[PDB]
Design a protein around this ligand. Structure first.
Ligand SMILES: NC(=O)C1=CN([C@@H]2O[C@H](COP(=O)(O)OP(=O)(O)OC[C@H]3O[C@@H](n4cnc5c(N)ncnc54)[C@H](OP(=O)(O)O)[C@@H]3O)[C@@H](O)[C@H]2O)C=CC1
Ligand SMILES: NC(=O)C1=CN([C@@H]2O[C@H](COP(=O)(O)OP(=O)(O)OC[C@H]3O[C@@H](n4cnc5c(N)ncnc54)[C@H](OP(=O)(O)O)[C@@H]3O)[C@@H](O)[C@H]2O)C=CC1
Ligand SMILES: [Cl-]
Ligand SMILES: [Cl-]
Ligand SMILES: [K+]
Ligand SMILES: [Mg+2]
Ligand SMILES: [Mg+2]
Lengths: 678, 686
């Protein structure tokens, strides 16, 4: 039992033509073309408008009143031929509605004036026949629309009263049929502006299918955080989504968040951008890729992926125009150069529902950096101050905090994979090296045709049978589900794996200092000791002790800067050590990336050191980590010892300290850097 | 976290060659094949057995003593190494039987796992990727990454420290003498596994636990890891495949729409690599093999359940049907009662071919599940199987041996399933052939330059992706396109006779010592109400149960009738309290939209169903003996005799003669007997 605007609902009976699918517009075209090549004169627009939601038998009776079997047969042949080429034109929101009504526990059916042969054909093609317990067609009914028998029979077969059932319809005739049955009427405009008579009959009215979905969803229970190995939804909506940067986060975390979606439907398409062509071609070659969760040896297949080139404009604009939600999964260095491709996308969207823009970036005030470079990019292209500030305040730009640690596979390891799995494909194509016999309730022509279908289906699918076991592994991800996003976008309210928060800035700072800062400094210490794995490195008593000692010095500083969050630091720090403890497939190199950027004055290392000096706290271990960062940059990255000091001096000069504290810090740090080398 | 023989285990470190993979026997084969090519005479089995444990130099000097000083041993050894990699790369690394089953058990027990191999990183990593077992291991410690290899404990000590564990917290698996010394010295719980050569007395004394093979350790490990809970609806199947094959003798409604799911869930750790199902239907066989898979539809939740790793065979094909009984570890007989006598010949040939076969899959007995609705079903099959074996074998001792060797299991099934029509299947293939044609419109490569890769391997990478794309791209559509062949209900648990060790870990199976208890509940609660409801619907002019449940009188009667029978069974069988409550709702859910469920077949042979010990009269006597309401049951009995007289044209005199005879057989007081008779005949009037 579902409560929809106070009234209790047990079932939901749907109309097919004009309500579920846009087949009424096609029937309008076919009947016109059919008449032109038979009788010569096209049918009156008044006749066709009166024949909407009317049985083929009842449509012929109207033709006698004005002035059909020969006409309608060829018109039906033209229609199903158009459907076999272009597919059934599914109204936007149908699949999203049907699943919500099914999982609410409603007993659903279809009441259409079309034949059982034509009705099923479209219900099968669209893949929505599985949502209905019964269907009532314009064949087994005695008195067709606008008589309520078809809507009474549909309700009776569901073992419910019509007054307990919702009834969807587009036509004027069909609405009367739904109303006289005495069920909760819903009217969806298709090819007739509702009359005063029609609007009075209908209990609820909506301009399109997606308008009803929005109204329904406020009564539908919003599903909660998915579990690790929990499946994604089966049914697909007509919405697209984007991943600007098919990297560790985009491919190995966001892909799961988007694939789960609301738990009712998934995006039909996920467009992801990368310049890594091997990654691009490999995913598109397989059709899917898998995220490996090493802790539980679980491979998570991500399907309905379309990997595109980042430099290729038409494909990037394709994403920014069609996508309902796009995730920006780029590091700081990429923001400026990529802001130009973002600017083109959003301006193309204006030229073409508000976009939900997720900024996934490990920086304090990540949105500001993106929005700064976006404004500069848009203004330089558009050359209009008004159109830019409209775009900037139309779309939902959301800050995020991601706790999950994800790793991108190397091109050598992906080549090693492709090489090994190609040998299996070659051998499979040798092992493979038909006649549908017996008159099994079929005609000889059907059996002959069936044989040809199965022959070329086997020929096409047989090579791809190996994909049942064979997966394309591209990411090593930990089992951390919940992403923390800013409040604003109504779409994010219903996303399962999203947890909305208020003051993100406070969390971003703690994430930067306590999480990202210690992660980088132990990764430098681990790298210099000869560890290539974070997980293995944490098996060393010295490496873990250093991380514990750093955590202690950072929390002591954050406890003064954020006394309101002091209570939660011990939990956050312990959660970090756990994630590091068994990060075996997570390479130190990935975390130790760009030491100088991370050794900036307003970043995860020097910011903590500054706080501790001001408040007379110990920064002994924090000072060592800073030196190990410059030691890593000179040794592993080969950046020069002269440039290291010119960065050290510059960034220490930018710190909010007295000249006394600066002199001491620089002298203490430069001595400790020379000590490690000599 | 995982207790193994009273010892807390947090780690598991495996040797690679001889312990995980059967690479020692592959090296044997190649060395002989390589010797046959070059020197003309292949190296003796006895020489290669003598070489196990010895170094390459000691092995070379031994080859010189036997086959002459100028023997090209290094040339033969290199050729053998080349033949080994070639076979491993195309046909796959030979995995020891039961490894994946063990690795999943240890991993789901939360153990950190490593590989300690004297092999070099490059070849070791390829083998683990090839076998698809690398996912299971956190770290890997190689011979080129230690100063002192086996028998020095460094490689096992390093592996343990990399997992943040002491050696004594780790299970250490090994086949070779030196490796066991390395594992033992380190202080780990050593598990010695025989590969080819019987281990010496010193090795057996050293080892904490010894097993003839992996599967003997798997059987021991099963005692320390749990049987998983009853699968829920929409719960995924296991990801990892084991090396077992299973069979469905009769790819029908229940075979493909229920048993397929049970076998696909298996023990929740792994599932069979192949499910061989038999059918005479060409369209079904050729369609499933073309897709490589089919799907089961659950209307209630609108869920399409995809059954992977299926292989449909012809029921009239001997070589295919014999291969089922030869290769399968467990077979399910999903035939009707009419098909037993005919197929018993094909069963006899199968089990006799298994008896005659010298394969390793036929050494262990067969677990035979009898999926048949009739009481004493197992024994009907056993009768026909005995007759069919005798006439084929012409040997009474061989016939009886086979009948006593295998596990024949009675089963009680509660899931109603309907097989799709060939007309509806043809339509499904026609509609989803247009989508294939539509998909092949779009299909009509370059990986630029990484710079991280070399042009030689970068050019070669283009060949792989292009070849993969050309073959896989047509089958991209299968992502969200299924082949629906079965409409099934949401009932999960299958009741099976306890006995077969292979059933002890199957999670969707409910093991019972005697099937009689749940088969009595199936008779009275399910089939009894089904018959009494069908009679009520028929006399009120309804052809299907599905249509009838729309009537408030029919659904109200069904609900009230379920309550009376359940209340009785709760006193008779209080140990099945949870089973009664579950089976009650399952019946009412299935009845709701049972449009393909005619009353005639459910209402056939009424007088047999109205017997004193049968599904109607027995329930009345129980409810009377325990003072419970039987008003709906009494109405149910009346409708049966009424249905017999009106529809089946049974004489009223014949119905009463039966009615009275059944009442007098019931264990009631002479007073209670007469009362029921007077009440029942009074209702038959109306
Ligand atoms: N990975 C993690 O565990 C977490 C990281 N983060 C943060 O989220 C963001 C995700 O970055 P991540 O995906 O980890 O890094 P990756 O390198 O794994 O992927 C980065 C993406 O950005 C693109 N990119 C990288 N450098 C440039 C550049 N100089 N110019 C243009 N495009 C570029 C890459 O394109 P191509 O594919 O062609 O290289 C790739 O698509 C970062 O800010 C990261 O710090 C957040 C928390 C956890
Ligand atoms: N489905 C249900 O509702 C339930 C079924 N059961 C029991 O399971 C058993 C099978 O049910 P179901 O699967 O519906 O039976 P089906 O008729 O659907 O298919 C049965 C299998 O046996 C074969 N078969 C059928 N008749 C013959 C015959 N006369 N000679 C040779 N082979 C034959 C079929 O071959 P082909 O594939 O070529 O037709 C098919 O493989 C029955 O005893 C039934 O009572 C138990 C609980 C409920
Ligand atoms: Cl390689
Ligand atoms: Cl196995
Ligand atoms: K077992
Ligand atoms: Mg209409
Ligand atoms: Mg060995």
């Amino acid at each position: 039992v579902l409560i929809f605007h106070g009234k209790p609902v047990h079932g939901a009976i749907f109309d097919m033509d004009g309500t579920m699918f846009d087949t009424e517009r096609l029937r309008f075209q076919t009947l016109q073309q059919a008449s032109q090549e038979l009788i010569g004169q096209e049918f009156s627009h008044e006749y066709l408008m009166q024949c909407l939601g009317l049985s083929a038998t009842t449509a012929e009776k109207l033709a006698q009143r004005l002035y059909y079997k020969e006409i309608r047969k060829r018109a039906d042949e033209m229609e199903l031929e158009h459907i076999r080429k272009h597919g059934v034109p599914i109204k936007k929101g149908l699949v999203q509605v049907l699943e919500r009504l099914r999982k609410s526990g409603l007993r659903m059916a279809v009441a259409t004036s079309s034949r059982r042969a034509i009705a099923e054909e479209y219900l099968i093609n669209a893949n929505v026949y599985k949502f209905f317990d019964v269907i009532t067609c314009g064949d087994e009914v005695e008195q067709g629309k606008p008589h309520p028998e078809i809507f009474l029979k549909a309700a009776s077969q569901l073992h419910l009263d019509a007054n307990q059932c919702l009834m969807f319809e587009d036509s004027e005739n069909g609405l009367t049929s739904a109303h006289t049955s005495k069920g909760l009427t819903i009217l969806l405009k298709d090819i007739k502006e509702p009359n005063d008579e029609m609007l009075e009959k209908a209990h609820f009215y909506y301009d399109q299918m997606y308008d009803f979905l929005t109204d329904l969803d406020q009564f539908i229970p919003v599903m909660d955080m998915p579990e690790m190995q929990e499946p994604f939804p089966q049914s697909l909506n007509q919405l697209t989504v984007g991943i600007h940067g098919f990297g560790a986060i985009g491919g190995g975390y966001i892909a799961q968040i988007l694939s789960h979606w609301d738990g009712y439907t998934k995006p039909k398409r996920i467009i992801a951008s990368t310049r890594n062509s091997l990654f691009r071609e490999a995913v598109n070659a397989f059709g899917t890729y898998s995220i490996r969760y090493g802790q539980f040896s679980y491979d998570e297949r991500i399907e309905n992926m379309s990997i595109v080139d980042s430099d290729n404009e038409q494909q990037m604009l394709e994403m920014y125009t069609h996508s309902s939600l796009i995730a920006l999964c780029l590091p700081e260095q990429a923001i400026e150069s990529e802001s130009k491709i973002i600017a083109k996308g959003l301006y193309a969207r204006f030229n073409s529902e508000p976009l939900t823009f997720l900024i996934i970036l490990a920086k304090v005030g990540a949105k500001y950096l993106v929005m700064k470079h976006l404004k500069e990019a848009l203004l330089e292209l558009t050359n209009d101050e008004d159109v830019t500030e409209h775009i900037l305040k139309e779309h939902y730009f959301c800050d995020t905090v991601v706790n999950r640690m994800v790793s991108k596979l190397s091109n050598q390891n992906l080549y090693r994979q492709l090489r090994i799995k190609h040998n299996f494909l070659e051998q499979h194509l040798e092992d493979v090296e038909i006649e549908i016999e017996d008159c099994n309730k079929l005609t000889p022509d059907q059996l002959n045709q069936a044989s040809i279908y199965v022959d070329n289906m086997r020929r096409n699918f047989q090579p791809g049978h190996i994909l049942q076991s064979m997966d394309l592994i591209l990411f090593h991800s930990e089992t951390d589900m919940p992403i923390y996003v800013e409040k604003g976008s109504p779409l994010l309210e219903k996303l399962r794996q999203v947890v909305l928060v208020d003051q993100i800035t406070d969390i971003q700072l703690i994430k930067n200092r306590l999480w990202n800062g210690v992660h980088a400094m132990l990764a430098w210490y681990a790298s210099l000791m000869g560890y290539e794995s974070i997980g293995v490195a944490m098996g060393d008593h010295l490496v873990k002790a250093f991380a514990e000692n750093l955590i202690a010095e950072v929390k002591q500083g954050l406890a003064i800067v954020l006394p309101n969050y002091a209570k939660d630091l011990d939990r956050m720090s312990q959660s970090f050590l756990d994630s590091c403890e068994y990060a075996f497939k997570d390479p130190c190199q990935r975390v130790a990336r760009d030491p100088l950027r991370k050794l900036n004055h307003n970043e995860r290392v020097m910011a903590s050191i500054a706080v501790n000096i001001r408040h007379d706290l110990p920064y002994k271990n924090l000072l060592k980590g800073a030196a190990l960062g410059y030691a890593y940059a000179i040794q592993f990255l080969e950046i020069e010892e002269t440039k290291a000091v010119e960065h050290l001096q510059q960034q220490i000069q930018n710190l909010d300290l007295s000249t006394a504290q600066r002199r001491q810090l620089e002298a203490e740090l430069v001595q400790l850097i020379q000590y490690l080398f000599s």
